[PDB]
Design a protein around this nucleic acid. Structure first.
Ligand SMILES: [Mg+2]
Ligand SMILES: [Mg+2]
Ligand SMILES: [Mg+2]
Ligand SMILES: [Mg+2]
Ligand SMILES: [Mg+2]
Ligand SMILES: [Mg+2]
Ligand SMILES: [Mg+2]
Ligand SMILES: [Mg+2]
Ligand SMILES: [Mg+2]
Ligand SMILES: [Mg+2]
Ligand SMILES: [Mg+2]
Ligand SMILES: [Mg+2]
Ligand SMILES: [Mg+2]
Ligand SMILES: [Mg+2]
Ligand SMILES: [Mg+2]
Ligand SMILES: [Mg+2]
Ligand SMILES: [Mg+2]
Ligand SMILES: [Mg+2]
Ligand SMILES: [Mg+2]
Ligand SMILES: [Mg+2]
Ligand SMILES: [Mg+2]
Ligand SMILES: [Mg+2]
Ligand SMILES: [Mg+2]
Ligand SMILES: [Mg+2]
Ligand SMILES: [Mg+2]
Ligand SMILES: [Mg+2]
Ligand SMILES: [Mg+2]
Ligand SMILES: [Mg+2]
Ligand SMILES: [Mg+2]
Ligand SMILES: [Mg+2]
Ligand SMILES: [Mg+2]
Ligand SMILES: [Mg+2]
Ligand SMILES: [Mg+2]
Ligand SMILES: [Mg+2]
Ligand SMILES: [Mg+2]
Ligand SMILES: [Mg+2]
Ligand SMILES: [Mg+2]
Ligand SMILES: [Mg+2]
Ligand SMILES: [Mg+2]
Ligand SMILES: [Zn+2]
Lengths: 137, 143, 172, 191, 52
RNA sequence: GCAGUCAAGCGUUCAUAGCGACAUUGCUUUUUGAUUCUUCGAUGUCGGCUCUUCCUAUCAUACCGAAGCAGAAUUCGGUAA
RNA sequence: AGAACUGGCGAUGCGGGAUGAACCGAACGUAGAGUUAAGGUGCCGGAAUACACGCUCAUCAGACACCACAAAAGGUGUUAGUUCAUCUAGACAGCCGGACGGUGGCCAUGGAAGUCGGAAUCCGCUAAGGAGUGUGUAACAACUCACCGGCCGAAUGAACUA
């Protein structure tokens, strides 16, 4: 294999349309979209569908997701909304294991005591047939 | 002093668009100082050449788009090593002086100006191999 | 000095014998509350005209909110400031989404780079730069290119718990 | 002022391939193969195509950005050395005592040994680095010529031999003796 | 002895340099500043004195 | 007592190789003074002898850089107690 | 060493300044609950290895009033800034082309034509080309620069401020 092989490190980019998970604060847990770049540490984000108000944010308190969609620099909320919808962003998001893990996390946290109990009894039943399978091959 | 000099360059250029009524855009790629000096001697009568820097021409032309706006469509022919030959004589006696005289191992022509029209320097040297038949190769169509 | 606010401060000399109704003057002032705003009005008004507040009054205080607070813009900032050895004039650019933002980082910057505390700094003029590429300072100009995008290498996730059972990764 | 992105370019001539992983550059051309550990510098490599590789420094300042250009040059000399190769010539310079130079070896060593230096009874020895080869010119008086795939190991070996001849306790303006590098060039492509 | 071009060679190492007027450091002939941190990177250089 | 900044001069010529005036910034606490805080119901007051250890502003010895370093001799400087 | 007004110490503990008469905070019956001051919150040590924008790498870094020192003088470290100048009539840099005619200009001498060397430094033609930057020949050649241009596309030089 005589090619030049250069391990091309593949970063999430801060760019217009890069969608981001908001980490801290009033809009914690929600998805926004980068609209314009302010400086090396600040951006202007907007998350119309999610209910996060258009604002300047410190790139610190937001986490870049791999999701990025088509959006013209500096777009107003209204069209930010129009394009995100068009882009089926939310759909792609909820499809990621990142998204699902968040929700599983969310679900366990919700279990009542009794519920929690049942999970044990079922985990017990599934283990039986699993140890069984295991001990056969 | 460079404000002075440049200003005058437009002057001796603005004065060659009003004087002469036609213009050759030549492609003096290579073509030494000596060679270029001798084409001056071989055009001393009618013609005159004026070599210029491009970004001073493409701007001075646009800045002359008042009177003589026909010269506007020179610009897409002012790239590369170019020069200006102004004249009043016919085509194939000036261009025949230019393209021919002096060479080794000769400056070319890239386009021609006339009354707000352009000539590929090829359609200015017709060898009458269709100029005669223009009233002959269709004259038999009338009979 | 905290979260800054901009104030229209308007005042006039007190009325008199010869001048019933004297001339109103206005300043725009970046201060963090009204009490400072009005005090910084009288500071300058002592230095420009020769009013003392004892012989004047403050006709109005109004907060000047930012027009388009969610539109990123490039501000030009003119500053007079005092140093350990002299007093100087400056110009700098700050890219932000509001006037009040711009000033906060101006005041921080003057303090990091030149060790200038609030007191040693007059804000001369702060004005949006309408025509891009009137932008003079590079550290802003490099954000103005078409299709700008950059990565954010070496990401350090803050840990909650004190021990972790996996050797972390910095992989944004 | 912290530069948002700044990059450099490395032309990969025909014949040589270059593979890079965790910043350990491997370079194979006709002459053979050279590797370098550039891990000590945060530069990120990207291959545009087998002809051209780019080197970038993201969000870096003055000095960080300064490491970029030198990284390019390092990867370049890797390449040219693995194609044109390197060749330093030297010259014995002596006013009265002829400098006798030879290759000896102890335990398959190969040292450059140097004798009679300014009338010295001491026998100097410069080890010959691996990968660099020492020849003696045949039409140039007192020449000596080191050559090989890396400038680095060649240049050093040359400097190594020239250092060993420094002249102590004499006005070194008068006593010019030594072995000095007289030409730096390639193996292919003229001399 | 030693032909002019070899004298010229060995001068490129021994004679054609500059000196720091603070710490005597032997420096590149076109040098503007001294490399040594001890003399505070001074730019008070002189040329290495040429022989007879 | 020691060390700097300036560079008029010295140095055949050439400020600074080695020096450096008129001025000026310092450092030190083996000088001398100034003070009088401690001891006057008592800290034995010079020199030497003996012995240990410390400082470095290095006289020698190691390795260097510099010169008005040809060699020899020397001088200036660095790392060095 | 000696005066001035006030506040202290002395006569006074307490919290802070590790330490300490005199600083900061605050003055004191025996106690409970709360809140603070000055000062702190990596660990010693009660209290965010909090948040945010910068700056700094010291083979002698630095780290908080009183306070346990530093100066004239200097740095092509690095940051921000100032002024003059150049540049969209296209600079700077980088590559690439041309680098001409009177003319081997004049004296000089084995010879010396731009370049051992004396005296000037004129002109033409020019977009530009010195009676010549250097390499070079015995002397021409040959190469080369200053100068102009083809491309590139927005910055570049110099002096400074802290
Ligand atoms: Mg001041
Ligand atoms: Mg002030
Ligand atoms: Mg010596
Ligand atoms: Mg000697
Ligand atoms: Mg050298
Ligand atoms: Mg040192
Ligand atoms: Mg001298
Ligand atoms: Mg003298
Ligand atoms: Mg002397
Ligand atoms: Mg006493
Ligand atoms: Mg007693
Ligand atoms: Mg006793
Ligand atoms: Mg007794
Ligand atoms: Mg010492
Ligand atoms: Mg030394
Ligand atoms: Mg001398
Ligand atoms: Mg001698
Ligand atoms: Mg002797
Ligand atoms: Mg002697
Ligand atoms: Mg001395
Ligand atoms: Mg000892
Ligand atoms: Mg008091
Ligand atoms: Mg008493
Ligand atoms: Mg008290
Ligand atoms: Mg203390
Ligand atoms: Mg007080
Ligand atoms: Mg402890
Ligand atoms: Mg604690
Ligand atoms: Mg270092
Ligand atoms: Mg103070
Ligand atoms: Mg500085
Ligand atoms: Mg200006
Ligand atoms: Mg550049
Ligand atoms: Mg060339
Ligand atoms: Mg050229
Ligand atoms: Mg001559
Ligand atoms: Mg000659
Ligand atoms: Mg010639
Ligand atoms: Mg200033
Ligand atoms: Zn030095």
């Amino acid at each position: 294999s005589t090619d030049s092989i250069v391990k091309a490190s593949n970063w999430r980019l801060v760019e217009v349309g890069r969608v981001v998970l908001i980490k801290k604060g009033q809009s914690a847990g929600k998805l926004a979209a980068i609209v314009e770049i302010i400086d090396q540490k600040k951006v202007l984000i907007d998350g119309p569908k999610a209910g996060v108000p258009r604002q300047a944010i410190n790139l610190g308190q937001v986490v870049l997701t791999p999701l990025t969609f088509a959006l013209p620099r500096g777009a107003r909320t209204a069209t930010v909304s129009k394009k995100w919808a068009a882009a089926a962003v939310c759909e792609k998001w909820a499809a990621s294991s990142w998204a699902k893990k968040i929700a599983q996390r969310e679900r366990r946290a919700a279990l009542t005591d009794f519920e929690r109990f049942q999970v044990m009894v079922l985990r017990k039943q599934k283990r039986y047939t699993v140890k069984k399978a295991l001990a056969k091959a | 002093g460079i404000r002075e000099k440049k200003a005058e360059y437009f002057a001796k250029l603005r004065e060659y668009l009003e004087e002469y009524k036609s213009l050759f855009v030549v492609g003096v790629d290579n073509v030494s100082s000596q060679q270029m000096h001798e084409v001056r001697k071989e055009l001393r009568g009618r013609a005159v050449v004026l070599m210029g820097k491009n970004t001073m021409v493409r701007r001075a032309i646009r800045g002359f788009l008042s009177d003589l706006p026909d010269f506007e469509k020179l610009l897409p022919f002012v790239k590369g090593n170019v020069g200006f030959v102004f004249t009043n004589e016919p085509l194939t006696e000036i261009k025949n002086v230019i393209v021919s005289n002096r060479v080794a191992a000769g400056l070319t022509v890239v386009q021609v100006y006339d009354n707000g029209q352009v000539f590929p320097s090829s359609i200015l040297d017709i060898t009458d191999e269709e100029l005669v038949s223009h009233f002959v190769s269709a004259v038999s169509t009338i009979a | 000095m905290a979260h800054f606010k901009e104030y229209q401060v308007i005042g006039r000399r007190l009325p008199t014998e010869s001048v019933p109704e004297p001339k109103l003057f206005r300043m725009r002032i970046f201060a963090s509350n009204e009490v400072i705003a009005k005090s910084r009005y009288w500071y300058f008004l002592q230095k420009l005209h020769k009013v003392k507040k004892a012989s004047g009054e403050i006709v109005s205080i109004n907060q000047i909110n930012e027009a388009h607070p969610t539109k990123v813009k490039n501000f030009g900032v003119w500053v007079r400031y005092d140093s350990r050895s002299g007093t100087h004039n400056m110009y700098k650019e700050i890219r932000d989404v509001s006037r009040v933002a711009a000033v906060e980082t101006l005041y921080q910057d003057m303090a990091a780079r030149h060790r200038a505390r609030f007191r040693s700094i007059h804000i001369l003029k702060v004005a949006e730069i309408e025509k891009t590429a009137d932008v003079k300072r590079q550290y802003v100009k490099q954000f103005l290119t078409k299709d700008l995008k950059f990565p954010l290498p070496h990401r350090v996730q803050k840990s909650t718990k004190t021990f972790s059972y996996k050797r972390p990764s910095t992989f944004y | 002022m912290k530069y948002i992105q700044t990059e450099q370019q490395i032309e990969v001539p025909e014949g040589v391939t270059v593979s890079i992983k965790s910043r350990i550059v491997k370079v194979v051309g006709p002459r053979g193969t050279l590797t370098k550990n550039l891990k000590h510098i945060d530069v990120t490599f990207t291959k545009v195509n087998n002809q051209l590789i780019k080197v970038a420094v993201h969000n870096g300042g003055r000095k960080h950005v300064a490491a970029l250009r030198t990284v390019k040059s390092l990867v370049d000399n890797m390449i040219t050395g693995v194609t044109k190769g390197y060749k330093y010539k030297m010259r014995y310079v002596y006013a009265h005592f002829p400098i006798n130079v030879n290759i000896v070896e102890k335990d398959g060593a190969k040292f450059i040994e140097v004798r009679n230096f300014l009338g010295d009874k001491k026998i100097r020895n410069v080890p010959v680095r691996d990968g660099v080869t020492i020849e003696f010119s045949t039409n140039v008086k007192d020449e000596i010529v080191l050559s090989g795939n890396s400038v680095e190991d060649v240049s050093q070996n040359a400097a190594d031999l020239q250092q060993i001849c420094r002249v102590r306790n004499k006005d070194i303006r008068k006593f010019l003796d030594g072995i000095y590098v007289s030409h730096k060039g390639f193996i292919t492509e003229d001399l | 002895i030693i032909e002019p071009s070899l004298k010229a060679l060995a001068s490129k190492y021994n004679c054609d340099k500059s000196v720091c007027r603070k710490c005597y450091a032997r420096l590149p002939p076109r040098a503007t500043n001294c490399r040594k941190r001890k003399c505070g990177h001074t730019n008070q250089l002189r040329p290495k004195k040429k022989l007879k």
